Amino acid sequence: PSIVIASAARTAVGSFNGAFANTPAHELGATVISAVLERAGVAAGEVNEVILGQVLPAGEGQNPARQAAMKAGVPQEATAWGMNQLCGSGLRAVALGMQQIATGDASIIVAGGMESMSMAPHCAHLRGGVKMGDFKMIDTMIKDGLTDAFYGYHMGTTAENVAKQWQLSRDEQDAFAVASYNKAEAAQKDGRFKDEIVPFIVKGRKGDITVDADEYIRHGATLDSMAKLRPAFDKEGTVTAGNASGLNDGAAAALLMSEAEASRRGIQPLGRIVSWATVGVDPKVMGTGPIPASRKALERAGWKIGDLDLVEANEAFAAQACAVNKDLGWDPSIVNVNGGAIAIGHPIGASGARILNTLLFEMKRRGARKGLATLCIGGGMGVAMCIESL
Amino acid sequence: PSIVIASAARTAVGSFNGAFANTPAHELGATVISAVLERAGVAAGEVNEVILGQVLPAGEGQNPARQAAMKAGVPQEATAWGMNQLCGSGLRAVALGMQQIATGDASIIVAGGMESMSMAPHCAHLRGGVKMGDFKMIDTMIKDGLTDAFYGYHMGTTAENVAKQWQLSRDEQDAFAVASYNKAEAAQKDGRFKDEIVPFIVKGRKGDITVDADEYIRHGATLDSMAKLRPAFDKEGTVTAGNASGLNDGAAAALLMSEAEASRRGIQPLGRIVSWATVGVDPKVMGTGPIPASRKALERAGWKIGDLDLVEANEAFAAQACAVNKDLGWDPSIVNVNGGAIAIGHPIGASGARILNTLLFEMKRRGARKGLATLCIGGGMGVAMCIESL
Amino acid sequence: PSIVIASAARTAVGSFNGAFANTPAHELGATVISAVLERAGVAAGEVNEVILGQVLPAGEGQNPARQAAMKAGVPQEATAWGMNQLCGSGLRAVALGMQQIATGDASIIVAGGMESMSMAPHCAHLRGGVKMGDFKMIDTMIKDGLTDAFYGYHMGTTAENVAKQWQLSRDEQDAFAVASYNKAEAAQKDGRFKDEIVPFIVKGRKGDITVDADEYIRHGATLDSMAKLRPAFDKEGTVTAGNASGLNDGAAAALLMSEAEASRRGIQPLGRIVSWATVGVDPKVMGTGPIPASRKALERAGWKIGDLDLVEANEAFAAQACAVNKDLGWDPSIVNVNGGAIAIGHPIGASGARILNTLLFEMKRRGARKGLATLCIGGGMGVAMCIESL
Amino acid sequence: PSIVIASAARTAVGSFNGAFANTPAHELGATVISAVLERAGVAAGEVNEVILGQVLPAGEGQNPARQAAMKAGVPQEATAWGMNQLCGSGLRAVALGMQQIATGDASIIVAGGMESMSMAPHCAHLRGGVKMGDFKMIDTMIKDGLTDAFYGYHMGTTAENVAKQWQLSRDEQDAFAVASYNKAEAAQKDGRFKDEIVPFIVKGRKGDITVDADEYIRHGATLDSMAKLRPAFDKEGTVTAGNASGLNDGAAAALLMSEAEASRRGIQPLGRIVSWATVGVDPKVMGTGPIPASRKALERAGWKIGDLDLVEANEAFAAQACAVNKDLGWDPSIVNVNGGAIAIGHPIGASGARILNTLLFEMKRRGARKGLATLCIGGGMGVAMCIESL
Ligand SMILES: CC(C)(COP(=O)(O)OP(=O)(O)OC[C@H]1O[C@@H](n2cnc3c(N)ncnc32)[C@H](O)[C@@H]1OP(=O)(O)O)[C@@H](O)C(=O)NCCC(=O)NCCS
Ligand SMILES: CC(C)(COP(=O)(O)OP(=O)(O)OC[C@H]1O[C@@H](n2cnc3c(N)ncnc32)[C@H](O)[C@@H]1OP(=O)(O)O)[C@@H](O)C(=O)NCCC(=O)NCCS
Ligand SMILES: CC(C)(COP(=O)(O)OP(=O)(O)OC[C@H]1O[C@@H](n2cnc3c(N)ncnc32)[C@H](O)[C@@H]1OP(=O)(O)O)[C@@H](O)C(=O)NCCC(=O)NCCS
Ligand SMILES: CC(C)(COP(=O)(O)OP(=O)(O)OC[C@H]1O[C@@H](n2cnc3c(N)ncnc32)[C@H](O)[C@@H]1OP(=O)(O)O)[C@@H](O)C(=O)NCCC(=O)NCCS
Ligand SMILES: [Cl-]
Ligand SMILES: [Cl-]
Ligand SMILES: [Cl-]
Ligand SMILES: [Cl-]
Ligand SMILES: [Cl-]
Ligand SMILES: [Cl-]
Ligand SMILES: [Cl-]
Ligand SMILES: [Cl-]
Ligand SMILES: [Cl-]
Ligand SMILES: [Cl-]
Ligand SMILES: [Rb+]
Ligand SMILES: [Rb+]
Ligand SMILES: [Rb+]
Ligand SMILES: [Rb+]
């Protein structure tokens, strides 16, 4: 009937081919699963199901969500499965886990997302046999994660469509990025990511290395070097590597249970899932995904846009993040207080749960009552979820 | 609420590198999605979400479930996503779509599964660079679909564990397979697969080919040549290619809606989802998955094992299929009346919905009231669902 | 000194991915080496060196010419090496082996060529590491064998340059091919290839297969179906798969020794190498290679064009073979009496020794006195050699 | 009947994945060909043929020897071809070019070798098609250059056989390496490699880099750190990365003409080829190759072992270089005065011409009369050449 979030955690967002360059996704997920359990005082033997969104699982083995649960100590009598809704996967898994408890099919869910874009392999269909000529080794990260399957161009091109449709200049996108860089670096210096980040131990041969800080956050982002970058998608476009998100590795999850079950255990939940929604749009302008999804989520919760005290909207691109702020018209000072994916990072399968962690711990830190998390999804979709504190 | 199955359809299960050797999975899903709509009198513009189970989506593009819906005519306003619970994905997706309507978040769902194991590519992580020496090109079908990620051996080895644990001789497993071949060949000659199979048109260059018959069903399976086959996993084992399922391509789905919504359209539903369950077991004996999953599903429906009039249990291996019939103790004459995965084929991500199609259409022809469909899942899991006719 | 050809042999020219689809080149060469040593009565312990031309040795191991000699029984004390002059490799090795005996550095040479275009792999430089994006798997057969390294297009395009330069219409090129097909089909039925072809035993698992007939020779080549084919290179060109050679596998070699050594052993030599030459031309019109190379060889032999009684000119393309016959002006009835590479096949590294076999055994069969063999070489070269009977 | 070396040059021997990591082999050869022509005052239009030994030509295009000649300015009228006798390719091509002029078939030859082991790709035969299972991507450098095709193990194991046959201890092999390192490091400081090295311009995007020094020569090689490496081949062996050669890139060649031709042009030849030889040995002890090859060369020159004033013997391994010096018994102080392949590097296809440059220019530097160059060849072969100054 009423589902709450008992605890939540996330790993540090590592850079592409960086600290997590050789760490499989399920190893990052296993650390987060052990974290949300310890943070709520819940043993691993009590978890009924583990739902982890993941977009690039090729080469990781049979069902990496099951591997994450077994490695984290969840017994074999429990189940685990993954799902793929691209960028909104980490947040949709929380909605899927929420329905499992609402329909009486489960009691305790560890739901979230995990992604290791560095570990994505190059593939090629070779069963038929190449009789003659050259063939391509396809990058699974680009093909299955970043390339639109209906028009053939990158997700950065869909941001160029939103830039031309909403008339967002290069200087306007760069200014939004600089605002995102400085907000994330400030939250990192003040330690506003410490409560949500669980340290990850990178198992090495010549010594272990502990990763507990987002390594993608840039220090001292200058606007002068921001405007010297060339566009990375359209030759005469406006989206660059500075005003766009990056390729990153990470994992994030939360522990789900009913409000009555949390009262039995004396747990003080981070928030209460009051509504959620997912709507589809034109794949050409997939950045506009959060616009109708946030309205559907607020309508299902009986809330107005002004009722929200804190908003976490994923910053896949600066060209797509400004239109959501302009169409919905909410106060930009309550959106991404600690920065967005332009500065922190964007692991595809885990970003849905990543911004939920940042949203939950910031609502707890400043006493916010109503929150909302939303992301844009490639192929023309968007997901949103409204959280209310208890 | 009460969720029913308005319509269901499936493509013919093709052999490995056979009729669907160059057909992507989402093209098979689009045919099944267009089928369940044209079999229930529901337009494509009414579908809210498309949930398609798939285990090997590497190289197919961004979210093949979205591509299948767009190709089938589902408008962009709707959403679509895929999920991976290995062999039970096609049936778990039906349970997930059922929960969407139960929680009031959707009205019409096209849920099922699709898999093209022939289109599965070989992958290799090459971002770090191979400084010196040879490296392996990993088969995603073997690694991500057929190899246990905890012990390293094939799923056929888990059948060898069930063989010695349940003391199932080589002659008993072959006899079960021969019975499955003769049941499937009889159902094919009598046309008991015609109502559930939607013809698929293989787009070619030198002429189109319509595929409307399961090409993996062998005619005149003899036990003499069955006992000459060598074991395909353990050198001194008992599971062979004859008493085990095969690698196949196919897709299957169903149209989900509430019982009141179906009455508003005058649709005669195939059945009513009354219960479902998923339980985990030891990965060593993953063939025992359907044993506790069917018991929890029957318990949630208020049914006994004797109340079931028709049962469809997936035959991943003859060594694993005999133990399910011995432990649950139901009458084997009502289990897989038209044959199982040993004779028809086993597309992993779609098999859960495949046996649901065979179960639904066989209940309709003989007037069965209570049914149950269940499959074993790699890594030590199992899923079951109980269907009641209207 | 005076160098003669004591004996010569060749394997049947197999089709692309045909009878020799999985046979390495050195296994084909070892059969030819064992043949020329058996057909002349020379023991393996007397061979000083083995010179085998090969263009595509990637993936076959350290020095396939050494593997061919060791497998054929030639002792380790002898030497062996391979060389690469593209299409003229099989014939240049005979000239190189001839120079070893003329300079007093050797007594008995087994020189020839071997090629397995079916075993040619796809390669990719992967030491630096592909950080992001797709990369091509380059076909070594296309890249290292059929693509000119100075202009980038196929050898069939260089035939189009000769086609436009000499004004050879589509009907004139097709008519030359039909003459070549009918000559090869007649020579195969009459058994004029039996003396030169050594049977090769294809080592298999389910039974061995003896190959002693050229499987690429097509029966009943019609001019009506010849004009139906589309151009295989230029979209509005004239060279098709019918008037051009094909991709084939095969091996050929000859036994070289001084004229005095052959008289000691009672060997009746097939012919005496009287002259040879190799000249380079423009790579765009590499088909004109045999024109100045045959003239330089005849000049070094003191022969006129009319003195030749039998000529074997390589038919890489009908557009390039007509220009050579038109420029040199020799009688077309004495040129390629038993067909050319258009009908028999064209193993690149072995074609030079293949047409030498056809010339030697046909000169012996009709009592011809003076002969000449010549080929065109990619990149703008040509090789020729004059043979005189004893 | 007397062939001299008009000029010779070589590129700096670059480390594996070092300065020449992205430089194709023929680009290094083109620099050496242009060098030997300018150093003798001979125009490119006078070269008749270019013979360049190369062992790893996969992926470089049609006949890389032809690409080196055309890029260096040699006109299209001349010919060019490559040959492969493994490690003795660079020296055998000089002997082959010598025979072209001795037999009156050519007047001016540019012969040598080129190799780019960094550019060696990974290959796999994919025409038949991998129906199921994993397959290996074979390293062409290891397979086609360093792996014995008769026993399957590395060339370092063949060095272990020579180590066990002559009873060469670990301390004895390491001492030979330190002596080679100190001789090469001293010769580089004194500038004894400046006359033979032609600077190579590495064309880059962010600035060009001039390469004129062997970057593989290690500075300050200590004997203490030499006895701290683990064996790289046998688990309980004695050959390590210190007492063995390395993987390197480089090119070297020489200008060949008759002694009368050098007089007609006023050229001061580097030396006169007086004899040459190539003998085969057991592949297990391929390091003993130079022992019987040098004896046959000295016998053909009418020289004794004491007549040699300077010797350049290739040091593929410390275990194989000590046995050759102990069996032949020549003065070690005149053998590899400036170091060997252990310190300078070992480009397979170019090492034969590399040590020939060091031999020619050191004979000129100290007034040596008689010289000899010899190498060991994998698969059980050896090549030798005797050089006398004029
Ligand atoms: C945009 C993208 C192609 C960048 O690829 P990339 O080139 O590897 O990004 P990099 O940062 O490593 O390279 C960018 C360069 O710009 C510079 N740069 C990046 N951000 C900068 C900033 N904020 N200020 C100044 N300079 C910056 C860096 O120094 C870097 O190295 P370089 O200058 O030497 O070339 C990729 O990260 C991307 O697509 N991101 C968006 C993710 C996406 O498309 N979809 C996510 C799901 S919708
Ligand atoms: C067992 C398996 C490896 C077989 O591989 P396969 O070689 O492609 O199987 P094939 O049928 O194509 O070939 C098997 C051999 O047995 C023969 N054979 C198979 N079934 C036979 C039968 N019923 N009667 C007689 N002979 C039979 C085949 O003809 C073939 O012999 P052949 O060499 O003359 O062709 C594969 O089918 C498999 O793993 N299936 C199980 C899939 C799975 O694990 N799913 C998940 C379970 S949870
Ligand atoms: C031209 C080339 C690319 C052909 O590609 P290909 O399609 O694999 O050639 P194929 O064997 O498949 O023949 C193709 C078609 O032409 C038809 N064909 C070929 N020769 C024919 C003939 N003589 N009469 C009628 N039809 C003919 C075949 O039947 C086939 O039709 P199909 O696809 O229905 O079977 C290849 O043979 C080639 O590159 N040749 C040149 C070799 C070369 O370059 N040598 C070095 C030059 S120096
Ligand atoms: C020996 C071989 C197997 C591996 O060499 P490698 O280890 O991959 O290359 P390196 O030795 O430079 O690797 C560098 C390591 O060795 C150390 N090292 C390299 N050269 C050294 C030297 N001369 N002295 C001491 N240490 C050295 C480096 O410090 C580094 O230390 P690390 O192990 O912690 O990384 C391979 O290079 C080889 O087979 N070489 C011979 C090839 C050949 O036989 N050619 C002739 C054909 S017959
Ligand atoms: Cl526990
Ligand atoms: Cl339910
Ligand atoms: Cl850190
Ligand atoms: Cl509850
Ligand atoms: Cl209802
Ligand atoms: Cl129907
Ligand atoms: Cl519609
Ligand atoms: Cl694919
Ligand atoms: Cl991998
Ligand atoms: Cl269990
Ligand atoms: Rb960024
Ligand atoms: Rb089967
Ligand atoms: Rb042909
Ligand atoms: Rb070394």
Short mmCIF file of C-alpha atoms and ligand atoms in Angstrom, two decimals, chain A residues 123-125 144, chain B residues 56-61 119-122 140, ligand 12:
data_model
loop_
_atom_site.label_atom_id
_atom_site.label_comp_id
_atom_site.label_asym_id
_atom_site.label_seq_id
_atom_site.Cartn_x
_atom_site.Cartn_y
_atom_site.Cartn_z
CA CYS A 123 31.20 -7.45 -30.86
CA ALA A 124 30.60 -8.88 -34.32
CA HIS A 125 28.13 -11.46 -35.63
CA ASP A 144 23.49 -0.51 -27.74
CA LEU B 56 21.16 -11.69 -25.83
CA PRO B 57 20.56 -8.12 -27.10
CA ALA B 58 24.21 -7.25 -27.80
CA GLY B 59 24.65 -5.55 -31.16
CA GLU B 60 20.93 -5.12 -31.87
CA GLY B 61 20.83 -1.39 -31.04
CA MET B 119 22.25 -13.33 -34.18
CA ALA B 120 24.29 -13.46 -30.96
CA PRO B 121 27.76 -12.00 -31.63
CA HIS B 122 31.27 -12.74 -30.41
CA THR B 140 27.90 -13.96 -25.93
CL CL E 12 24.56 -8.66 -32.93
#
